[PDB]
Ligand binder design. Structure first.
Ligand SMILES: Nc1ncnc2c1ncn2[C@@H]1O[C@H](CSCC[C@H](N)C(=O)O)[C@@H](O)[C@H]1O
Lengths: 130, 385, 40, 408
């Protein structure tokens, strides 16, 4: 398509981004997101899709890398995805990533609630330091 | 690296693009970055099958993986473009070769002449041969064959005589391709005296077997069931330098047969080429398109291709019947409809099916016939003189 | 908001003889401060 | 060389606020046949942050708590005044406009109150576009039975409140506020069309307020506003802030979003106006025929999530069309062009079936508005409302035609 001089549709890039996440290819998923920004598209929706695919396909470690890069870059995720990332990290004992995300969640403008704190406490209660 | 490059070279030599694509995918699936030579073999295979879109993707992918193209890579494109007459794309390489620090060797000049010739630019073809001698260099045997085809195409009997006799003036024994071009220029001008003079030279040919068999089969001596096995024996022997040499041999042979009136024999010779993989893009027959692609053929070969295609049309419906005479960037311009191939095909179609095939308003190098008009349609007589 | 948590602590404890040795290694065995002649 | 080379509002309009610490920066108040407005008096260049456009001191406002108990900020009602009993007798949920109307009429009666002066720049009973002032004939031009019944209930509620609380036995200090029902109806109309509800912190107390804010109730509505309101607690000043990074040209109108996410029938009920480019207007389709949501959004370059659609022909009506059209979506399944044309054709037929329900068309309503010479403000508002809905349905037919062709 690029070699034919045609401009890929925003939906075409999203199909490639979602496919990359299903295979756990975060590097290719991030390369395609950079292309959409170069094509002057809106990468927020495609970034949301990429993170959810990695979480669904048990690539939580890769999902955190992609999520934080977008969140630190200024993009604001959905409240559903915020609750997804915090909870899945705390179920896996990853307090460091769950605390980083919750800090970015409030920086965006979404204040943490009792649900998010209960996720962090689930890991803090097992560290041996009350 | 040694095994991958060895197989891909064979695929590029024989024009097996499907196998070449699988080797490339196999290398990528194993996290192996193919070498710059390996991609050049894949680019070669696509050009053998006239798959320019997939060839330029591989060329684009070479820079992506850091396997920058070598001098041989810019030759695989030039010969691929030369066969199709895509001198617009050939000049892109030439304008790129000077900027890339690569001087113009002899092989670059041969492709330039071949590209201009197939594109109908006769004036610019001889100018390259005129400008080639100024830059010294050393014209090889194919260069003489490259410029002889230019004179033979534009019906220059006296120029072709001087070019041909000088080929044997150095004791070179010109190949069968040059002999078939002599028969075309003599057959185009109806010079039956010179045709018989050259044929007797090919009938003895104590040194070269191919000239004897091909020369004999043109006259019709080998048109028997058992006597067609010897002709096929030569074709199989020539079917070993790949599709690159084969396409040149069959283009000259069909051109000679058509101008000599052996139009039914040209039909069977073309049928021999297709089953060997020559002209893989020649025909498409599906529910959407019935197409014949003649942009890589000579004028005699194109007439044979159209004649068979028209006869097979009347036997049988697709949404469209098309003739692809120009296949490149020239399509999106008014020059493609003025190409010698486009005019020849349209003129040929006009006095064979009346006014049933008209040009396209969206492409310069297409000659279409709608499904509705296909209802209002042997159509072409195939006989030996 | 979530507090910027900062957990730092210091403790004093009685020291084992083993920890005393680990500090030094280093045994001072002479009551001399400085040599009279070399001033070393 | 230099030698060889909408009317402005009453100058006293800004001055009465200006002598009381109202500040306007780079904007001017201009008056036209349709009413007041705020326009950029110069090219407002973009900055890294929101620019201060206007500053309105708290003491010039009339505010009441949204939630019970009813406290007034600033407190202007004396202890024991009978107006509080009238305010205190209201329904806490529905009668917020009655409470503000009582405060508004009370404020006009006070000699020192700012709204005694500012009240002269409020639209009169024949100039306010609120449907509370609309006659039964004006409501007949709406062509919307649901909205008409809503307005009739509003007028009934407002009238019964006046008859109950402004009877013959009430004190003179109450009678002189609303001597007639029309005076109280006008006050409720001002309350509905001009009330600004915000969460504010005053001192240490954070609360929701219904506020009558002078010079900020002159900002017109837009669903793509270039300004927003911001309460500054430290000095009790309402700030009108232009969007950060947004360049505003000289003469461009300064607008805020009165009602995010609200349809035109809600804008008509509250503020007595409608917009043809409302991105939240809806049209009742059967759902038998559906188009591809992803294709429709990409054809018109509508990006973002459904609740935050934006355009990178396309306006708020096309965004509204995306939200209201029957749509299907199967992750990344592509739509068949021949099946989508059947849906587009069937959706356009249903759109024309609804345009045929109206006795007139959109351009006939537009020429009727130009031919008016003695029409009430609400009559023209009623015609503009039905015309905008026709323009919205007509925009959908055009958008579907474009979408059907750009799918090739
Ligand atoms: N976008 C818009 N289109 C039409 N009328 C509008 C509008 N925004 C605001 N209005 C009108 O302005 C009123 C809100 S108070 C805004 C100032 C008003 N124009 C005045 O002169 O006092 C509403 O009653 C409504 O009728």
């Amino acid at each position: 398509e690029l070699g034919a001089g045609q401009r890929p549709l925003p939906e075409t890039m999203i199909a490639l981004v979602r496919l990359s996440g299903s295979k756990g290819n975060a590097q290719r998923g991030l390369e395609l997101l950079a292309a959409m920004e170069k094509l002057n598209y809106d990468i927020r929706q495609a970034w949301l899709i990429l993170v959810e695919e990695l979480v669904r396909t048990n690539h939580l470690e890769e999902a955190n890398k992609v999520f934080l890069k977008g969140a630190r870059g200024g993009m604001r995720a959905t409240d559903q995805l915020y609750d997804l990332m915090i909870e899945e990290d705390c179920k896996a004992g990853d307090h460091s990533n769950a605390l980083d995300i919750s800090y970015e969640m409030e920086a965006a403008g979404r204040f943490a609630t009792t649900f998010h704190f209960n996720c962090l406490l689930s890991v803090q209660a097992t560290c041996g330091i009350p | 690296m040694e095994t991958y490059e060895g197989i891909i070279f064979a695929c590029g030599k024989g024009g097996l693009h499907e196998d070449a694509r699988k080797i490339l995918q196999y290398m990528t699936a194993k996290d192996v970055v193919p070498s710059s030579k390996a991609y050049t073999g894949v680019i070669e295979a696509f050009g053998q099958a006239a798959l320019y879109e997939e060839a330029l993707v591989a060329f684009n992918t070479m820079h992506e993986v850091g396997s920058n193209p070598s001098i041989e890579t810019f030759h695989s494109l030039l010969y691929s473009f030369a066969r199709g007459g895509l001198f617009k794309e050939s000049e892109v390489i030439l304008s790129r070769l000077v900027n890339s620090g690569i001087p113009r060797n002899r092989d670059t000049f041969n492709a330039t002449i071949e590209a201009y010739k197939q594109g109908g630019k006769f004036e610019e073809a001889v100018k390259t041969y005129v400008d080639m001698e100024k830059s010294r260099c050393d014209p090889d045997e194919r260069t003489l064959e490259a410029v002889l085809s230019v004179y033979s195409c534009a019906r220059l009997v006296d120029e072709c005589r001087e070019q041909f006799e000088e080929m044997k003036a150095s004791d070179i024994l010109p190949s069968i391709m040059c002999y078939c071009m002599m028969l075309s220029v003599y057959g185009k001008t109806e010079s039956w005296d010179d045709v018989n003079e050259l044929l007797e030279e090919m009938l003895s040919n104590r040194v070269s077997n191919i000239h004897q068999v091909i020369g004999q089969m043109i006259k019709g001596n080998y048109d028997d069931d058992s006597n067609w096995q010897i002709v096929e024996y030569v074709l199989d022997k020539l079917n070993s330098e790949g599709c690159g040499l084969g396409i040149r041999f069959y283009n000259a042979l069909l051109d000679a047969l058509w101008w000599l009136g052996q139009k039914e024999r040209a039909a069977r010779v073309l049928n021999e080429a297709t089953k060997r993989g020559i002209f893989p893009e020649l025909f498409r027959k599906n529910k959407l398109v019935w197409s014949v692609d003649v942009h890589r053929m000579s004028e005699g070969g194109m007439y044979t291709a159209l004649s068979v295609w028209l006869n097979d049309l009347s036997d049988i419906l697709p949404q469209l019947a098309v003739v692809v005479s120009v296949r490149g960037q020239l399509e999106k311009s008014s020059a493609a409809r003025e190409s010698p191939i486009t005019r020849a095909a349209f003129s040929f179609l006009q006095d064979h099916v009346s006014s049933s095939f008209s040009f396209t308003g969206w492409n310069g190098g297409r000659i279409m016939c709608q499904r509705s008009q296909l209802k209002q349609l042997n159509i072409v007589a195939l006989t030996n003189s | 908001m979530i507090d910027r948590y900062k957990h730092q602590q210091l403790r004093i404890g009685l020291v084992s003889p083993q920890q005393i040795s680990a500090w030094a290694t280093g045994e001072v065995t002479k009551p001399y401060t400085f040599h009279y002649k070399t001033n070393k | 060389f230099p030698l060889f080379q909408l009317e402005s509002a009453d100058p006293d309009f800004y001055k009465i606020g200006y002598v009381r610490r109202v500040r306007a920066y780079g904007v001017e108040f201009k008056e036209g046949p349709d009413g007041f407005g705020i326009y950029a008096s110069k090219d407002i260049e973009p900055r890294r942050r929101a620019r201060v456009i206007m500053e309105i001191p708290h003491e010039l406002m009339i505010t009441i708590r949204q939630k019970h108990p009813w406290m007034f900020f600033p407190d202007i009602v004396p202890i024991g005044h009978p107006i509080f009993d009238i305010i205190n007798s209201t329904d806490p949920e529905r009668d917020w406009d009655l409470r503000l109307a009582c405060l508004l009429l009370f404020s006009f009666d006070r000699e020192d109150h700012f709204w005694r002066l500012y009240g002269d720049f409020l639209p009169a009973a024949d100039e306010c576009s609120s449907l509370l002032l609309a006659t039964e004939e004006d409501l007949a031009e709406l062509q919307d039975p649901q909205l008409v019944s809503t307005i009739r209930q509003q007028q009934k509620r407002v009238l019964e409140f006046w008859e109950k609380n402004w009877h013959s036995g009430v004190p003179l200090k109450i009678k002189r506020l609303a001597e007639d029902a029309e005076r109280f109806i006008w006050a409720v109309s001002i309350a509905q069309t001009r009330c600004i509800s915000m969460k504010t912190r005053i001192g240490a107390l954070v609360q929701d307020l219904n506020m009558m804010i002078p010079y900020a109730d002159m900002l017109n509505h837009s669903f793509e506003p270039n300004c927003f309101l911001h309460w500054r607690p430290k000095d009790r000043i309402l700030e009108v802030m232009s969007n950060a990074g947004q360049a505003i040209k000289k003469g461009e109108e300064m607008t805020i979003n009165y009602m995010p996410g609200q349809k035109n029938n809600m804008l008509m009920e509250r503020y007595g106006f409608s917009t043809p480019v409302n991105p939240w207007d809806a049209i009742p389709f059967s759902g038998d025929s559906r188009i591809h949501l992803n294709s429709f959004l990409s054809v018109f370059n509508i990006f973002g999530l459904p609740e935050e659609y934006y355009h990178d022909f396309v306006d708020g009506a096309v965004i509204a069309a995306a939200r209201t059209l029957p749509t299907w979506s199967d992750i990344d399944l592509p739509p068949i062009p021949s099946a989508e044309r059947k849906a587009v054709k069937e959706l356009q037929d249903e759109c024309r079936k609804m345009l045929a329900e109206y006795p007139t068309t959109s351009e006939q309503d537009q020429k009727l508005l130009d031919s008016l010479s003695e029409a009430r403000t609400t009559f023209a508002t009623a015609v503009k409302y039905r015309m905008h809905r026709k323009m919205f349905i007509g925009k959908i037919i055009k958008a579907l035609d474009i979408y059907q062709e750009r799918l090739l």
